[PDB]
Amino acid sequence: GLSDGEWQQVLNVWGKVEADIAGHGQEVLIRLFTGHPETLEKFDKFKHLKTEAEMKASEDLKKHGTVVLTALGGILKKKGHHEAELKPLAQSHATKHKIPIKYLEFISDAIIHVLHSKHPGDFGADAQGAMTKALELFRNDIAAKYKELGFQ
Ligand code: HEM
């Protein structure tokens, strides 16, 4: 649950992402894959990537980064009223991709890391607080659907 002022911070930060969605999406996935190499094994189309240089050179990884952040941005713009947008993603990630909630924690922290890396000194403590709360809400509502499905 976020206040109006917190949502305003989230959507202000998101403007930074929308200026370069592919570059942000690429770096988020690279941070996930290099920090948590077990996550790469869930992607049949990226498991061939052995080095970060190959990851950086992969145009399909940048494409998928655009898909991921476009979906997340659509959810964030609903300011919590995201049941219709979130349900299909919860279902596909639990039942088809088999993504444990832990990996959603990993990618949430990766987003925070990338924002500081690309905007050092321009991602203030209030903005980090609000973005963190928004990603916690996203993860918590996914977790509720995971529990319904019995997925661990
Ligand atoms: C912010 C969190 C995430 C968002 C918004 C997101 C979004 C998406 C979307 C929109 C798709 C394509 C449609 C679909 O299959 O539902 C997708 C596919 C997929 N996601 Fe995610 N995802 C997220 C996190 C993760 C994480 C953490 C993992 C694994 C560590 C993951 C694994 C996958 C896989 C394996 C696919 C299929 C890729 C393919 O072969 O095309 N997702 N995701």
From Swiss-Prot:
<keyword id="KW-0963">Cytoplasm</keyword>
<dbReference type="InterPro" id="IPR000971">
    <property type="entry name" value="Globin"/>
</dbReference>
<keyword id="KW-0349">Heme</keyword>
<dbReference type="GO" id="GO:0016528">
    <property type="term" value="C:sarcoplasm"/>
</dbReference>
<dbReference type="InterPro" id="IPR002335">
    <property type="entry name" value="Myoglobin"/>
</dbReference>
<keyword id="KW-0479">Metal-binding</keyword>
<keyword id="KW-0597">Phosphoprotein</keyword>
<keyword id="KW-0560">Oxidoreductase</keyword>
<keyword id="KW-0813">Transport</keyword>
<dbReference type="InterPro" id="IPR009050">
    <property type="entry name" value="Globin-like_sf"/>
</dbReference>
<feature type="modified residue" description="Phosphoserine">
    <location>
        <position position="3"/>
    </location>
</feature>
<feature type="binding site">
    <location>
        <position position="64"/>
    </location>
    <ligand>
        <name>nitrite</name>
    </ligand>
</feature>
<feature type="domain" description="Globin">
    <location>
        <begin position="1"/>
        <end position="147"/>
    </location>
</feature>
<dbReference type="GO" id="GO:0004601">
    <property type="term" value="F:peroxidase activity"/>
</dbReference>
<comment type="function">
    <text>Monomeric heme protein which primary function is to store oxygen and facilitate its diffusion within muscle tissues. Reversibly binds oxygen through a pentacoordinated heme iron and enables its timely and efficient release as needed during periods of heightened demand. Depending on the oxidative conditions of tissues and cells, and in addition to its ability to bind oxygen, it also has a nitrite reductase activity whereby it regulates the production of bioactive nitric oxide.</text>
</comment>
<dbReference type="GO" id="GO:0015671">
    <property type="term" value="P:oxygen transport"/>
</dbReference>
<dbReference type="GO" id="GO:0019430">
    <property type="term" value="P:removal of superoxide radicals"/>
</dbReference>
<feature type="binding site" description="proximal binding residue">
    <location>
        <position position="93"/>
    </location>
    <ligand>
        <name>heme b</name>
    </ligand>
</feature>
<dbReference type="GO" id="GO:0005344">
    <property type="term" value="F:oxygen carrier activity"/>
</dbReference>
<keyword id="KW-0408">Iron</keyword>
<protein>
    <recommendedName>
        <fullName>Myoglobin</fullName>
        <ecNumber>1.7.-.-</ecNumber>
        <ecNumber>1.11.1.-</ecNumber>
    </recommendedName>
</protein>
<dbReference type="GO" id="GO:0019825">
    <property type="term" value="F:oxygen binding"/>
</dbReference>
<comment type="similarity">
    <text>Belongs to the globin family.</text>
</comment>
<keyword id="KW-0561">Oxygen transport</keyword>
<comment type="subunit">
    <text>Monomeric.</text>
</comment>
<dbReference type="GO" id="GO:0046872">
    <property type="term" value="F:metal ion binding"/>
</dbReference>
<feature type="binding site">
    <location>
        <position position="64"/>
    </location>
    <ligand>
        <name>O2</name>
    </ligand>
</feature>
<dbReference type="GO" id="GO:0098809">
    <property type="term" value="F:nitrite reductase activity"/>
</dbReference>
<keyword id="KW-0514">Muscle protein</keyword>
<dbReference type="Pfam" id="PF00042">
    <property type="entry name" value="Globin"/>
</dbReference>
<dbReference type="GO" id="GO:0020037">
    <property type="term" value="F:heme binding"/>
</dbReference>
